[PDB]
Structures are given as C-alpha cells and as structure tokens.
Amino acid sequence: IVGGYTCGANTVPYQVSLNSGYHFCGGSLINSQWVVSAAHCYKSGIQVRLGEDNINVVEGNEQFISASKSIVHPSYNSNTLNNDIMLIKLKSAASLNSRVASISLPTSCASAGTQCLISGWGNTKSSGTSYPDVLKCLKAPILSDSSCKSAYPGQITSNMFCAGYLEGGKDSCQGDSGGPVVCSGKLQGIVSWGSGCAQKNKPGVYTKVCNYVSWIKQTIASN
Numbered sequence: 001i002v003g004g005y006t007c008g009a010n011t012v013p014y015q016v017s018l019n020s021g022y023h024f025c026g027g028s029l030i031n032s033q034w035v036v037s038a039a040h041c042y043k044s045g046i047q048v049r050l051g052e053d054n055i056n057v058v059e060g061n062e063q064f065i066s067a068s069k070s071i072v073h074p075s076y077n078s079n080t081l082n083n084d085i086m087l088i089k090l091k092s093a094a095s096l097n098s099r100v101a102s103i104s105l106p107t108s109c110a111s112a113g114t115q116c117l118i119s120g121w122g123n124t125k126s127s128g129t130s131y132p133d134v135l136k137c138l139k140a141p142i143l144s145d146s147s148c149k150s151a152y153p154g155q156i157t158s159n160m161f162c163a164g165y166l167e168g169g170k171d172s173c174q175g176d177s178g179g180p181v182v183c184s185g186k187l188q189g190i191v192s193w194g195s196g197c198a199q200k201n202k203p204g205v206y207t208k209v210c211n212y213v214s215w216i217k218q219t220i221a222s223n
C-alpha cells in the first residue's frame with residue numbers, strides 16, 4: 001500500500017497473509033473454511049496466516065493454517081489477467097472471533113464514486129521497495145469505467161474495475177495482490193494489477209468480485 005496509513009491491530013479481521021516461508025500475497029476470509037485471493041497468487045504449499053497485524057512479530061492472535069486445496073478460476077488468463085480470482089480451502093476451520101472474521105460477498109456491484117478500504121502488507125514505496133511490518137490501509141474510490149479505460153485503453157475487461165486516484169501517490173502495490181477491496185461492507189475487489197504503483201493516470205485495477213458471487217458460492221459448496 002503506497003500512501004496509506006496503519007490500519008490498527010486486527011481492525012481488518014478478514015485480511016489474511018499467504019505465506020510460503022515469507023509473505024507473498026493477501027487474501028480475504030469469506031467463511032471459516034475459505035479464502036478469496038487472486039489467481040496470479042497461486043503457489044503450491046500455501047500457509048494461510050489469520051489474525052495478523054505485525055507479520056514479523058508473534059503477537060498472540062495468529063492462526064496458521066495450511067491450504068488444503070486451491071481452485072483457480074478456470075477462465076483465468078495470465079496475460080490479460082482476466083478472471084484473476086482463486087479460492088483457497090483451509091485444512092481446518094479458522095476460529096472466528098472479533099480479530100478473525102469473514103467478510104460478506106456482494107449482493108450487487110458497487111457504483112463509481114464509492115469509497116473502499118484496500119489493505120495489505122505490500123510495497124509502500126512508489127519508487128523503490130519497502131515492505132511494512134504492520135498492516136496498511138488505504139481509502140480509495142471506485143473510478144468510472146470510462147476513466148478506467150481511458151487510463152488503460154484496450155486493457156480493461158468487464159471483470160475489472162479501477163479504484164484510486166488519478167493524481168498518483170495512493171495505491172495498492174506488489175505484495176498486496178489477492179487482498180481485499182471492501183466497499184460498503186462487501187468484498188467488491190481483489191488486488192490484481194496496474195501500471196507501476198501510485199503513478200499519475202494509472203490507477204489500481206481490481207478483479208470485480210460481484211461478477212463471481214454465484215461461482216464462489218457454488219464452488220465452496222461443492223468442494
């Protein structure tokens with residue numbers, strides 16, 4: 001997260017860290033057994049870390065649970081990043097409490113102009129590399145599809161939306177991938193891609209979760 005602020009310990013209780021010996025992507029807890037992340041975050045041997053604030057210090061609210069399976073959307077295209085969504089099943093159920101909680105899936109898509117909360121442990125520098133200890137947060141509005149396509153001509157599919165600030169300075173970044181964009185209490189986006197981070201006229205591009213709710217619910221029910 002570039003240009004954000006310290007969320008506060010366990011204030012984003014659906015935020016998880018995906019760990020393969022080190023933090024490499026975010027995710028969002030959607031029930032006690034399932035995490036939503038980005039397809040481009042797929043790796044074997046993922047350990048899901050819940051209840052994290054400082055990812056480098058054991059603070060006493062962590063749950064470390066191996067992924068038992070991952071289901072990458074079958075239509076994911078790793079060139080265009082269309083359908084950049086994956087579901088991770090936990091080997092055992094997370095224990096839900098005030099610090100580890102699921103986020104609701106949308107019942108409708110969000111509208112341009114709505115403020116959303118984007119969070120993660122990704123890079124905080126637009127011109128360099130710097131990874132934080134504690135979870136970082138950014139408030140950012142959904143941008144119009146027209147301004148999104150104007151920034152990224154030919155590159156935006158119906159399964160993507162832009163959010164952030166055309167002026168630059170405030171954005172998600174590498175290592176935030178797969179984590180949440182929550183708008184009006186609902187998981188509306190997944191950190192997916194962008195041209196650089198926090199650059200002028202290149203807002204963040206996010207997987208449009210509202211297009212996938214039926215797929216998510218049927219997949220987690222059957223698997």
Ligand SMILES: N=C(N)c1ccc(CNC(=O)[C@@H]2Cc3ccc(cc3)NC(=O)CCN3CCN(CCC(=O)Nc4ccc(cc4)C[C@@H](NS(=O)(=O)NC4CCCCC4)C(=O)N2)CC3)cc1
Nearest residue numbers: 040078079172173174177192193194195196197198204205
């Ligand atoms: N809000 C934000 N501004 C924001 C937030 C989060 C991100 C993070 N998400 C990205 O990085 C995604 C997705 C991605 C990630 C990794 C790889 C490829 C893609 N590579 C691997 O895994 C290695 C394994 N293998 C997979 C891919 N194969 C070939 C296919 C391929 O070439 N496809 C591809 C490559 C690049 C892009 C899209 C598709 C665009 C890229 N943008 S960029 O060029 O400007 N670079 C950014 C990266 C973050 C720091 C600032 C510069 C992008 O965004 N990519 C072979 C390799 C970024 C921005």
Ligand SMILES: [Ca+2]
Nearest residue numbers: 054057058059
């Ligand atoms: Ca910790």
